[PDB]
Amino acid sequence: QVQLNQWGAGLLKPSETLSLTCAVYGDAFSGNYWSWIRQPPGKGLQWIGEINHSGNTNYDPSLESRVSISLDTSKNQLSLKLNSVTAADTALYYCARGQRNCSGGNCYSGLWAWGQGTLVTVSSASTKGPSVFPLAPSSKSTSGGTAALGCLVKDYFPEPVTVSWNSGALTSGVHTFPAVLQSSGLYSLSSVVTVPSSSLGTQTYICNVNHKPSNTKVDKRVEPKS
Amino acid sequence: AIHMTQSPFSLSASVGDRVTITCRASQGIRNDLAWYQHKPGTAPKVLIYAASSLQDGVSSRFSGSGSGTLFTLTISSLQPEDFATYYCLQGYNYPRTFGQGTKVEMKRTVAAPSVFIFPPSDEQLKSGTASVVCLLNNFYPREAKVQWKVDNALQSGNSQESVTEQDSKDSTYSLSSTLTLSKADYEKHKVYACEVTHQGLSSPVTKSFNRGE
Amino acid sequence: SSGASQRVQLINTNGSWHINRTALNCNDSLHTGFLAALFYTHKFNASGCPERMAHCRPIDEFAQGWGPITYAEGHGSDQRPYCWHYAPRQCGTIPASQVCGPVYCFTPSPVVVGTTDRFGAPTYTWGENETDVLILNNTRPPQGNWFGCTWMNSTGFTKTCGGPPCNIGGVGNNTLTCPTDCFRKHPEATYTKCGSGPWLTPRCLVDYPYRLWHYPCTVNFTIFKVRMYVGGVEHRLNAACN
Ligand SMILES: *[C@@H]1O[C@H](CO)[C@@H](O[C@@H]2O[C@H](CO)[C@@H](O[C@@H]3O[C@H](CO)[C@@H](O)[C@H](O)[C@@H]3O)[C@H](O)[C@H]2NC(C)=O)[C@H](O)[C@H]1NC(C)=O
Ligand SMILES: *[C@@H]1O[C@H](CO)[C@@H](O[C@@H]2O[C@H](CO)[C@@H](O)[C@H](O)[C@H]2NC(C)=O)[C@H](O)[C@H]1NC(C)=O
Ligand SMILES: *[C@@H]1O[C@H](CO)[C@@H](O[C@@H]2O[C@H](CO)[C@@H](O)[C@H](O)[C@H]2NC(C)=O)[C@H](O)[C@H]1NC(C)=O
Ligand SMILES: *[C@@H]1O[C@H](CO)[C@@H](O[C@@H]2O[C@H](CO)[C@@H](O)[C@H](O)[C@H]2NC(C)=O)[C@H](O)[C@H]1NC(C)=O
Ligand SMILES: *[C@@H]1O[C@H](CO)[C@@H](O[C@@H]2O[C@H](CO)[C@@H](O)[C@H](O)[C@H]2NC(C)=O)[C@H](O)[C@H]1NC(C)=O
Structure with missing residues (x-):
């Protein structure tokens, strides 16, 4: 059973640039695709975007303006970056490995290997003890x-x-x-x-x-x- | 944009039931659908992909069916571990779009809340603010109303509750409402009454304290 | 990092699968070379193949399976990896020091898994770094990566992971835990559902260059090109059979 690993600074203040990485264990193989998911607090799961064996990507039309995903095959590392971040980008950010195959006509996708999450609080406050x-x-x-x-x-x-x-x-x-x-x-x-x-x-x-x-x-x- | 609408958003069931959440597509998504299981604290699990296949080692309870515009996840007999939130997801369209999720809580006997009211600490009043906490402990079902009457003055805007996730073992929710007034305003009034209405209460209960006690 | 290494002339394509990513941790003669590291050190299997293979059974021997298929996380006392009915442990991450030679995994087709740190980035230290590791963790494909892996450890014994295999049920204690295709003993234990390694059927293992090493008593075997389908994807591959 395969579980992924996410890195990155999670606290942001508005108009910075969020930048996670994620160690998808294992080499890029044909049909493999990797994607990023976020859960804003109280909301459902929300799709950010995918990058697949070919290097081309679907993003969400909301975030195309300011998001980007690459895959550094040299270190087997996935990358997510959100620009001009807003305080509303606060969410729990998941990275997922998956396989999408086409039996001619029909195709299926699915995400079988996942990160752990990274809470990203974006808020103009400064870290204060309780x-x-x-x-x-x-x-x-x-x-x-x-x-x-x-x-x-x-x-x-x-x-x-x-x-x-x-x-x-x-x-x-x-x-x-x-x-x-x-x-x-x-x-x-x-x-x-x-x-x-x-x-x-x-x-x-x-x-x-x-x-x-x-x-x-x-x-x-x-x-x-x- | 293919919009998936998932039914029902919430659902209460016992251990032993058949449970059939469903998920409808705005247009045909062929059968590129996928079902995931989400429990607070964990990453999601795929259970079903291609709308009807079982991911390796996902239990036989989980049947996926449907194609075109209409897909189901079906659990055979509900198991304690199965209580989670399930989201569908289509992989046929340019923006991948989820369903809203279905949170599957456990059903139990009605429990009435045990309301306690906590008065602001003297440690806090010296910092300039006052927090009145009103606890509603180990009740079911989850719906409840907590209202604050400062000398019968019904409040609004200055109250903040938050409720536990259902107990994994006794299936009881608990809620904590927190009034927060400045010291100067808390000094004006006498009675701080936390009024609780819940299904388990035959008529609403009120716990209260006077600013001296 | 990047050996840029000047120039090479002909028509070219990509970077490919590197050798430095092979754990040569081999404690019986170390090595004078690399072929040296693997033979005049470890695999001293001479001729005991008739009585090594004695401890394996045809599928007919085993108890017929009732009812619904489940997954066994037991793997216990089953310690003869050259028999088709070895019920292997699901693949973990094995530290580079316990591997001599390349590690092969089977989406039934065979692929090499190389040395890497605990964050998945390839290492090219011939696995002699201590933090080097072979991250073999597996999930049955159409979704995961491979049904199982086989390799050779630092004293030259073959050892395999994969699955986990199927508990097809059975009448008595003389019962089968299916790591392969079995639809003889239970009509749902196909390779796609129970395959946990190279063994396509009780009598066919996926041909791959070190099949002669890891499963040595299949030397005399016959090689067949067979199709297979794994959740829609066509696998064409050679099988050594008997
Ligand atoms: C491949 O599979 C193996 C075994 O399934 C994985 O090793 C396991 O890694 C998890 C990482 O969360 C370990 O869980 C942790 O255990 C410690 C024990 O103190 C606990 O404090 C943590 O909170 C957490 O629960 C687990 O123990 C460990 N198991 C073993 C035998 O090492 C390995 O990570 C997998 N490799 C992948 C998926 O890349
Ligand atoms: C694999 O390891 C060997 C270790 O020697 C590398 O070979 C050396 O490469 C460097 C530069 O690439 C040379 O300066 C040495 O003289 C080489 N020694 C030889 C030829 O034995 C080899 O490059 C490594 N492979 C890669 C590209 O990682
Ligand atoms: C074996 O791999 C380890 C990493 O897994 C190497 O150690 C790292 O070396 C870099 C060099 O800058 C350091 O920045 C890291 O902090 C080291 N890792 C840690 C956290 O200890 C090591 O060099 C490799 N080979 C050996 C032992 O020489
Ligand atoms: C390489 O793998 C073999 C796999 O069996 C290991 O051999 C076993 O070692 C244990 C512990 O020393 C013994 O109790 C068993 O009886 C051995 N089994 C057989 C059949 O020989 C061997 O130790 C491994 N070498 C390592 C771990 O480097
Ligand atoms: C592979 O087949 C060959 C021939 O069947 C076997 O090798 C011969 O075995 C006989 C004994 O019957 C010896 O007298 C010969 O000298 C061997 N010939 C050669 C050239 O090897 C071999 O043992 C078989 N291997 C296995 C694993 O059974």
Whole structure:
């Protein structure tokens, strides 16, 4: 089973030029074609363009204006480049190897080997570590033998943030929510965990936030509020 | 441009059902169609190519049929691993065009949300802003409404929710709504009520706190 | 990088398939040459072909298969690659140091796979670089790249990957795991569905230059030009048969 490898800088500010590469393992053979796919957040998969065994390409009419795909057969590397990038080009960019064959009349295509993705956030913001306030458990957050507490990870850029609890000890009942892009341009992730009511005073709940694009670490201890 | 329309956009099914998503072409695409499986976190998988062939090692459940303007993916008995999003894709035209995708969630018994309301931290209020979090935990179905009443003043514009992907194990969605007011405005009012309407609630629930508690 | 190497006169075409991309990691005499590296070192198969081939079976021996075809990721204890019913492990990436000679893969037609780093770019170091590797990972074509590969390792034993093969079912423990065309024992185990290597049928392996090396007891074999079809594409290729 064959899986591809994508490289490239993922954070952009508008009017730069996005430039990924992708190691399609294996030499160009007759009928082989390679293509790039992007998933803008919340939308479906969206086709960018193909380059095939012959070196000629279909692009999307939206992006022809400013896109380009080559295949450097010397290093078995696929290349995607988007010019004059806009903040709307934020998406998850996939590269796919595939085969298209014609039995005379009819033809079939299909993509059998894929990259891993590369999130590309294009946004005029600058990489800022998060502020992590506690979500303190209280009677209004406690109902039952089940109390809820958490961390609100607020105002970070760009997207990838990770929250673990009691330094990866606390597993059960955690929901780290999908972050949101607030009107500032920064992001607000929220991670909660439900724990036994009886243990609030006696078990210690630390949440461990990590925003790697700013080399930021934070271990906020979340405890009850009176 | 050959437009593929895919049906249904969403679909709820149990483990054991037959499931037939379909995909119609604006004009004939011969049978250059292809079916892909997408699960959050993973790359897509081809399941079916040439509209009716099974890619090597894609299960026998997955039948692809159709030709011309009308194509189906059909799963024989739904399997836990099969719960994903499926997109068709034609390879016959100058712009390759996808279907919109079909997200196939799992059906379960109705669950009511457990609403907790979290008040803004004092750590935050010193930075100048106030975040009121309203959690709706482990409910099904996914549809829900969260509204904010600051002293009965229904809000809008200043609220931002986001919902988990269905639980892989208990099939329950969870949602977190976040009011964000400046310190000066949060200081004006008293009651912060998060009102939740969900199918599992016989009548809408409200959790609330007064700015002192 | 690029040996520009001045000029050459006649009518020309492209850059072609290079030799430097062959892993010559061969620990039995190293080499005085290259042909030297492969023979007076490793493949010391003299005459034991009658009793090496003894441990292989006609397809008739094996249990008839019931029901629907599945894929076996077991590959276990099956360690006689010269028999047509070797159920091979699916192809991984094998480090250059464990290969002596060129590596052949079979979209049934045979192709050479060369040495390369872990990012797929060809290396021309005769595979003596440690980070050199042979990226053989496979998927059954009409879509993937080849049904299987055969090569020779650093002590000169033939070793094969491919498939993965088919579990056609069966009555007893004397049952078959089909790596080839089988529509005798199960009427859906064709090569396109189960072929996991050069073996076109129980008694025909794809002829290729090192067939005499990797599968040595098929010397006496007869070579036939046969058509085959793999998801629409015509394959015309020689088969050594018996
Ligand atoms: C050819 O196939 C082999 C085996 O299928 C591939 O090797 C596998 O590569 C994946 C890359 O994601 C490895 O997964 C990783 O495992 C580590 C273990 O610590 C984990 O931390 C990672 O998060 C990830 O899950 C996998 O272990 C590895 N398997 C072996 C036996 O090495 C190889 O990459 C394939 N070559 C291709 C497709 O070019
Ligand atoms: C394969 O490796 C051999 C290693 O020697 C290369 O042969 C050398 O090539 C360089 C320039 O191309 C010469 O300066 C040396 O004198 C050559 N030595 C010989 C002829 O043994 C050979 O070029 C390599 N092949 C390629 C093009 O990668
Ligand atoms: C064997 O291959 C490796 C790469 O896989 C070579 O190592 C690289 O050499 C370049 C030379 O500029 C460096 O920039 C890279 O950083 C090296 N790779 C890493 C990350 O270690 C190596 O030179 C090759 N042969 C040997 C061992 O001489
Ligand atoms: C080359 O491949 C052969 C394939 O069988 C390897 O031989 C086996 O080696 C293991 C471990 O030493 C033994 O337990 C087996 O009994 C051997 N099998 C036979 C039939 O000889 C050989 O070791 C490989 N050489 C390498 C890995 O360089
Ligand atoms: C390939 O065929 C030849 C002839 O059938 C075999 O070689 C001969 O074997 C006899 C024993 O019956 C010897 O006495 C001869 O000296 C051999 N002749 C030559 C010129 O090789 C050979 O063994 C066969 N190879 C295999 C793998 O069976």
